[PDB]
């Protein structure tokens, strides 16, 4: 993993994008790894890391989500990609278009014969000024569900510690969609959208923390 954690590789932190579509039997996380993108936390970080490590692949398939009435591809100087502002490669920061942010309501069926892992997020602004500037609504909401599951997250406005210029945060969540099931994403603000899904596998893959060099 060199300078990257597995979770940073998953999300597509620019300095970790070298790892796009990589596979492993054993992922080796180094103590020198660092994040260099939008500050985030993952409720149940340990589980997401585990399930991805066990899946043993970062194979990602972009899907043609349609986001009507919003601006796409938001970026940040907290997460530079080359010389300019940027963002996680696998996530799509949606904001208002013109003076409105509509209720987004989109669906993506799983018509394949494997499980899809979707990674998405919710933005927590540091201020009301921020909240409304981006999303127009004074308080947002993100609801992501399948035919038998649902997770709803309400963003929470307020300051966190300053990190790479930012007192705001993104929280990362995930949803698995089985063959014949379907994903629905419904949001009226604060959605950090997926760009597609990671293909799930089963097998012998895992992850280990070590600073030992790798020999031939």
């Amino acid at each position: 993993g060199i300078d990257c954690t597995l979770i940073d590789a998953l999300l597509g932190d620019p300095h970790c994008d070298v790892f796009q579509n990589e596979t492993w039997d054993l992922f080796v996380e180094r103590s020198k790894a660092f994040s260099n993108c939008y500050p985030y936390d993952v409720p149940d970080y340990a589980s997401l890391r585990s399930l991805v490590a066990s899946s043993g692949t970062l194979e990602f398939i972009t899907e043609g989500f349609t986001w009507t009435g919003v601006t796409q591809n938001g970026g940040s100087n907290a997460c530079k990609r080359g010389p300019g502002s940027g963002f996680f490669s696998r996530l799509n920061w949606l904001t208002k278009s013109g003076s409105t942010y509509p209720v987004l309501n989109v669906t993506m069926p799983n018509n394949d014969n494997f499980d899809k892992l979707y990674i998405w997020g919710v933005h927590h602004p540091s201020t009301n000024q921020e909240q409304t500037s981006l999303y127009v609504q004074a308080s947002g909401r993100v609801t992501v569900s399948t035919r038998r599951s649902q997770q709803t997250i309400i963003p929470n406005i307020g300051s966190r510690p300053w990190v790479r210029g930012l007192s705001s945060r993104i929280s990362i969540y995930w949803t698995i969609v089985k063959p014949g099931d379907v994903l629905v994403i419904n949001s009226n603000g604060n959605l950090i959208a997926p760009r597609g899904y990671f293909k799930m596998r089963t097998g012998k893959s895992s992850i280990m923390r070590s600073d030992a060099p790798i020999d031939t």
Partner: antibody
Amino acid sequence: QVQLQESGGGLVQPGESLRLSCVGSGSSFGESTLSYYAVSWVRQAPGKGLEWLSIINAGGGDIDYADSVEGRFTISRDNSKETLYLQMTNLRVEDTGVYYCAKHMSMQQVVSAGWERADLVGDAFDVWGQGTMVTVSS
Amino acid sequence: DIQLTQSPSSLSASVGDRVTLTCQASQDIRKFLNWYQQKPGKGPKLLIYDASNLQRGVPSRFSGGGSGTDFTLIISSLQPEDVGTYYCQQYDGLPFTFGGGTKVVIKR
């Protein structure tokens, strides 16, 4: 709404230089100020129409110039002062006119959120200043 | 450079008249077209953005239409305060350009 006010205009000899400034005040949606928006300089010669000169994005990038002033004028901004600048050099008689700074309507960045629009929209000029007169004459 | 041609150069009309101003682009600019009003000695003010959207605060008697190369600004009932010059302006591609203006003149 954001409000604009240009200054620095006056009479200058051909060949000389001159620095125009533009100060943003007020605020728009989400208490946004000028430093959230892309801005252009546009000028109007006496009795004539409007001529776009240059654009600069909220964060200082994506600069572009009209051919008539490329290589002589330089656009810049100090967001800590909510101020835009146009540095003109090697002025000629035909640069004479009223200079407006004009804000583009689409939000381009939110610093408190680390957000920056991927692209420079450069849509309609929803706010104009009152303009500043530049005369290039002997 | 995209050329915008406005006609007529000058238009005279009576208070209450329905007035139509036209803009023709030398190339297809889709709907990336804005209309401004400029009163003499004052800065321009946005009336219509992206061909058909009424800017907040602009009187509702202003409306805009068209796409591609042919556009119109319509004043449904001319008011005396409408005298001045109207410019169309294009942002499909740099450099941004403005029409040569249409002056509205009241017959009274």
